[PDB]
RNA sequence: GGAGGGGAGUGAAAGAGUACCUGAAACCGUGCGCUUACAAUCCGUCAGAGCCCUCGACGUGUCGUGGGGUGAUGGCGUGCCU
RNA sequence: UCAAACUCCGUGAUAGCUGGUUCUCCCCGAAAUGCAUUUAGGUGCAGCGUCGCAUGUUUCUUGCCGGAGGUAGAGCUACUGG
RNA sequence: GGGGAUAAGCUCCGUGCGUCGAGAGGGAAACAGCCCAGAUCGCCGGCUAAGGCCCCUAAGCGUGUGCUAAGUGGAAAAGGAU
RNA sequence: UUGUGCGCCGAUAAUGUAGCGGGGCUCAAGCACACCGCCGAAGCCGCGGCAGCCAACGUGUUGGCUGGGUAGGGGAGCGUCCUGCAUCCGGUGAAGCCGCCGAGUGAUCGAGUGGUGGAGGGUGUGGGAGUGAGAAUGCAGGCAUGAGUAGCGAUUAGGCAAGU
């Protein structure tokens, strides 16, 4: 819950632009 | 090659700030600035080298929005439940002090060199000091412009 | 007093006697070899314009040419089998500032 | 239990170096005319004639 | 026909634990222990000879500017204005000339703020 | 007490003594120099203070196109193989 | 030690299986897809690699001309169904 | 695009699309596949990308005009509200 | 009443702040739009050394392009042993070992010198290999950590004087 949601919402940073691996 | 500062080399003052309503921050980040040295071109990250400083009026600090009393200081004994927290003007209340050393503290490095210079770091909750003897040269924070 | 070459892509400060080592130049050991130059210093003013920098140079005798330190190479990577030795040596070529 | 690693020459050597000894003070005794150190603890029973001083 | 193997394996033995005499334990005693220690050490050698040039170039500009701050202009707006006045001297020297000659590195300084532009955060 | 050893000897050599050609490393210790008891360290590397040894040009001690041992402190850094 | 002892021999049994396989540099450099398979964790051929010879730009890219498509979309008193 | 609940760091196909695999370095707080960029070796040389310039962390408590009062920034729905 | 830009509540889990990376920040160090500079990588450039493909020329010079790399294919080499052949050193001290000073782009090298030690070795060209080990819950011998720790083998029980 709390882990998978921290991680697919860093992803919205700058310096990745939208997109990470294993989301 | 490149200058390196030898044992007998440094040259030490006593700068003193007054924190007479100075935003709190502001006031750290210079501080921090003096004592690790980033003002003389002599600078080295191995060595220290920055000059004391010495803070008065340190219970005349006031910083902005509700931080006085929504913001919460926090520690931990170690122990199970031993978190225990404190609001800023309970800790004015209580002793000044350690608002203004920890800030500073949080802004210097956390290693053997940082805490080898808050040695260099005195702070007082009044207007005073004993530290008169090296006559100490007041600082003014100013913004250079470009 | 002093100044400040240009050479091998690259920068020192200087004054007569100032021994220096520098990349390989093209000349013998004991020969002359004269140099551009960026900043100079006379005392307390200075030369700061690309003319009369130009309109001065540096003079320097080539004392012996050598070689630098041995620098040893050992490229690796891990769960591969990846490894690659290489070494090297950069020549050298010692001048001495005899004058300005 | 059994241990897990080989543990080290520092923390060996350090606790090994616990295992000390140290001496008896030691204090003279007038032994018939001459002179010999002994404990003490044994100080009485060497001058009435029971300690073997060798 | 028969080779014994010893000559050919002791040359490389020596000369690695000659290669480590400083590292402290079953890195200075061992050579299956230390020749790991040396793929990681030369290896962290080489990573370094190519990192020490932004070492001593963050070394300089903090010198340099904290040079100029005390003489009252910022580090960009100088390196602005040399770069406009074609002056050529390096960073490595600028700090060499923050320590021993203030005075020199004071008028260039003031060469700079010759030669900046008037308006500096105009649209040009 | 004896084992064992120190002198005196033999011998070209006893760093050939019946545990004996040479006599490595691991390993076990004794001395000499540096360093280490407010500190979080895949144990190293790059910069480097300070001290100690050394070669050389000089001068009553002194920097150097030096070199070597230690190395406070800072940055970087997630063992080897399958 | 017994759902068929022990020893020698056949025998260095055999394993689509696990592990292991030692000095250096130089150049180029993948694949994890297809059909079949008592077959799916293996293998054969094709695919992609390199080496040598042959054929010399035939490959690739951009522009312009020529060609079939029934996808998105839209449409339905233009068919089949709601 | 299919299966699934139009869920899965799920599973199955396409793609002169990519990267990892076999690919280091910088940024992402740490982080094989994300963005930049494809490492012949050296230099105590310079300019740049992505990203970022209060201190820790090198670079701007930069300029100008407006909004924000929520520590929003620095997780979030249906809906509610001078 | 419409559409907008930031905002409020809804909001809510278990070792410890803990959904800015931290200090701290609205006297923005936060969002937006324009502007100015700058830092920043092993990228590009700059000075140098090596190398591969091609090309031009002259009896091997230069230049352009190139040089991450696992499975893997190809090419060129060091080292060890025994030997055919020719020569060199060696009880006026070889090897082997410990070294110091130095070298090579690397495997490695010292016909460069010291200590120990006591009889075989080196060189160039060819030949042939039991030809290079860090891993196989690998074999043989030796030695460490655990450790100067656990134990010292019953439920009968030892003691004092004298003795050599």
């Known amino acids: 819950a709390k882990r998978g949601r921290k991680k697919r919402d860093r992803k919205h940073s700058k310096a990745n632009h939208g997109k990470r691996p294993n989301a | ?146 | 007093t002093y100044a400040i070459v240009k050479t091998g892509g690259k920068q020192y400060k200087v004054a007569a006697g100032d021994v220096v080592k520098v990349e390989k130049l093209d000349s013998e050991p004991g020969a002359s070899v004269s140099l551009p130059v960026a900043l100079v210093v006379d005392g307390a003013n200075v030369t700061s314009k690309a003319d009369d920098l130009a309109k001065v140079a540096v003079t320097a005798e080539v004392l012996e040419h050598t070689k630098g330190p041995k620098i040893r190479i050992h490229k690796f990577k891990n769960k591969t089998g990846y490894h690659k030795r290489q070494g090297h040596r950069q020549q050298l070529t010692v001048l001495k500032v005899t004058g300005i | 239990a059994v241990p897990k690693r080989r543990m080290s020459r520092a923390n060996t050597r350090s606790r090994r170096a616990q295992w000390k000894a140290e001496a008896p003070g030691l204090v003279t005794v007038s032994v018939a005319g001459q002179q010999r150190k002994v404990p003490r603890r044994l100080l009485k029973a060497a001058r009435l004639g029971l300690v073997d001083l060798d | 026909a028969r080779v014994k193997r010893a000559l050919n394996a002791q040359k490389k033995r020596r000369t690695v634990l000659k290669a480590s005499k400083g590292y402290r334990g079953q890195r200075s005693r061992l050579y299956r222990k230390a020749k790991e220690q040396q793929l990681h050490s030369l290896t962290y050698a080489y990573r370094d000879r190519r990192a020490r040039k932004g070492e001593f170039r963050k070394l300089w500009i903090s010198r340099i500017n904290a040079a100029a701050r005390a003489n009252d202009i910022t580090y960009n707006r100088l390196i602005q204005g040399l770069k406009a006045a074609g002056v050529e001297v390096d960073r490595k020297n600028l700090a060499e000339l923050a320590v021993s000659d203030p005075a020199a590195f004071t008028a260039l300084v003031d060469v700079a703020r010759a030669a900046l532009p008037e308006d500096v955060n105009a649209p040009s």
Request: avoid cysteine; charge should be positive; aromatic fraction near 6%.
């Open chain 2, 1 to 146: 090659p490149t200058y390196t500062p030898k044992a007998g080399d440094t040259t030490r003052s006593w700068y003193v700030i007054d924190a007479s309503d100075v935003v709190l921050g502001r006031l750290a980040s210079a501080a921090a600035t003096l004592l690790r040295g980033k003002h003389k071109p002599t600078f080295t990250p191995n060595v220290d080298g920055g000059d004391f400083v010495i803070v008065i009026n340190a219970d005349k600090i006031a910083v902005s929005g509700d931080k006085l009393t929504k913001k919460f200081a926090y520690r931990h004994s170690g122990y199970p439940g031993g978190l225990r927290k404190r609001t800023i003007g309970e800790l004015l209340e209580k002793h000044p002090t350690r608002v203004v050393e920890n800030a500073i503290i949080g802004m210097l490095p956390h290693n053997k060199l940082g805490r080898q210079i808050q040695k260099k770091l005195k702070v007082y909750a009044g207007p005073d000091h004993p530290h008169a003897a090296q006559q100490p040269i007041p600082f003014e924070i100013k913004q250079v412009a470009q």
